[PDB]
Design a protein around this ligand. Structure first.
Ligand SMILES: [K+]
Ligand SMILES: [K+]
Ligand SMILES: [K+]
Ligand SMILES: [K+]
Ligand SMILES: [K+]
Ligand SMILES: [K+]
Ligand SMILES: [K+]
Ligand SMILES: [K+]
Lengths: 92, 92, 92, 92
C-alpha cells in the first residue's frame, strides 16, 4: 500500500514534469506556470487563465488529459484512502 | 478486456467526431479547435477559451455533456486499468 | 432500474429547473443561459463564460454545487450503465 | 454513518476555512470571494473568474487541490448516499 502510493507518487511527478517541460517550451510559459497549468488540467479544474494557443499545444493537451487523468486521480484516491484516512482516524 | 477497450475506443472516437463536426459547423470553429473543445468539455476540464455562443450551441452542449461524459470516462478508466496499469506493473 | 432511472431523471430536471429560475432572476441571465450555466456547473465543466457576479449568486452556487453534483453524476452513471450500455451491447 | 458524515462535514469546513484565509490574505480576495473560489476549485468546477495571480498562490493551489479534492468529494459522496438518498426514498 505504501509501495502502491510511492509508485503513483513517482508516476504523477513524472507526468507533471513532462507537462512542465512541454508547456514551457512549446507554449512559452514560465516553468512554474507550466507546472501549475499541468496540475489545473489533469485534476480537471481548468481555470483557463492559461490554455494552449498553438495547434501543437492543443493536440498535446488532448493526449495529455486522456493519459494523465487516470494516473492523477489514482494518486489522489490512494492519497485520500491510504494516507489521509488513517491519520484522520488516528486523530480521533 | 481488449475487446472492451476497443469498443470504448471506437465509441469515444465517434463521440469526438460528432462534436468536431457540430462545433465546426454551428459554432464556426476550425476542426482542430472543435475537436480540442469537445475533449476539453467531455473530460470536464472546461478552460472556456472556446465556449458555445449560439443557443443551438448551448443546447447541444447540454445534451452532449450528459451523453458523452459517461462514455469518455468509461474509456479513460479502462485505459488506466486495462492498459496503463499492466505496462506499469510490467516495468517493475 | 428503469424506476431508478426515472427518479434520478426527474430529480435532475427539478435541480436544473431550480438553477434556471435562480440564475435568471438573481443573476439576470436569459432562461436558456441560466439552464446552460446550471448544467455546466453541476457537471463540473465550468467554462466561466457565465459565472455569478453577486454575493447572493456566489453563496447559492456553493450550496447548489454541493447538493447537485451528487444527483447529476448519479443520473449520468445510471444513464451510462442502465441505458447506453445495454443498447451498445445490443448493437453488437 | 452519521458520525462518518459529521466528521467529513467538519473536515470539509476546515479545508474551506483554510482556503478562505489563504486566498483573502495572499491573493487579496474578499473573504466571501475566497470561500467561493475555494469551493469552485476543490469541486473541480474552475470557472476562472478568480484564479491565483501570485507564485505563492499557484503553488498553494497545486497542493490545496491534491489534498482537498479527496476530502471534498468524500463528503459529497456521503452527503448523497447517506443523507439525500434516504430522504428521497422516504418521499416515495
Ligand atoms: K473549468
Ligand atoms: K481566461
Ligand atoms: K475566456
Ligand atoms: K471537473
Ligand atoms: K472544470
Ligand atoms: K474556466
Ligand atoms: K470568462
Ligand atoms: K476569466
Amino acid at each position: 500500500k505504501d509501495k502502491e502510493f510511492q509508485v503513483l507518487f513517482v508516476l504523477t511527478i513524472l507526468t507533471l514534469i513532462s507537462g512542465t517541460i512541454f508547456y514551457s517550451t512549446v507554449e512559452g510559459l514560465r516553468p512554474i506556470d507550466a507546472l501549475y497549468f499541468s496540475v489545473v488540467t489533469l485534476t480537471t479544474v481548468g481555470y483557463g487563465d492559461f490554455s494552449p494557443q498553438t495547434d501543437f499545444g492543443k493536440i498535446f493537451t488532448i493526449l495529455y488529459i486522456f493519459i494523465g487523468i487516470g494516473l492523477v486521480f489514482g494518486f489522489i484516491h490512494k492519497l485520500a484512502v491510504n494516507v489521509q484516512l488513517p491519520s484522520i482516524l488516528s486523530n480521533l
